[PDB]
């Protein structure tokens with residue numbers, strides 16, 4: 573009838589907080605929970621035949637994710653499937669620790685699977701320049717592929733640009749359609765330059781135009797402040813906004829247009 577631990581989250585976590593700062597878990601909607609840190613998001617989706625967990629945070633943030641899952645009363649061994657947003661250390665750095673202690677099978681896009689297998693980028697990664705423990709990928713996720721676990725059902729959408737193998741996940745919670753849209757930010761390491769890889773930008777455009785048109789009632793981001801999750805939690809009754817994915821993707825296209833303006 574209102575938050576309850578999401579109110580505690582607003583009091584405990586700030587906007588653009590530290591990646592490894594401990595934070596409380598709260599319920600997003602129905603079977604979907606937030607189990608991430610104050611700076612890095614981790615999405616837990618519970619079902620009758622196990623749970624799905626998206627993203628791990630860093631190797632230090634995975635300790636907070638493990639704690640937050642236990643705070644809600646859910647068993648880590650009941651986490652049967654691990655998913656990812658994109659293959660950066662602040663989101664999948666502790667994936668190997670969560671996979672080892674839960675026994676879940678980790679699904680990843682081909683480009684992300686190479687990073688998890690090697691523990692590092694990644695020639696075409698815009699931020700190629702910290703390594704993390706290697707993880708065991710059990711399945712490959714392509715564009716439009718579905719993930720099934722009992723009554724749970726998630727569909728992935730290849731939305732590269734921030735990373736070559738970034739994914740955006742969409743599921744239903746009972747209804748409401750939630751979308752875990754990737755960071756998609758036109759950020760990179762100094763000296764990478766976006767305009768040098770036009771093969772990388774057309775696919776960037778293709779995923780952005782796909783994300784904007786997805787059925788999308790509630791928006792979630794690996795960096796919570798990317799979708800103003802804290803403001804939506806503090807200001808309103810629900811996290812769901814009409815045209816949430818349409819506004820977010822248009823904002824990314826605006827940032828991308830200004831990023832390509834810094835070419836010359």
Ligand SMILES: [Zn+2]
Pocket residue numbers: 658660734755
């Ligand atoms: Zn990133």
Ligand SMILES: [Zn+2]
Pocket residue numbers: 660662663755794795
């Ligand atoms: Zn990040």
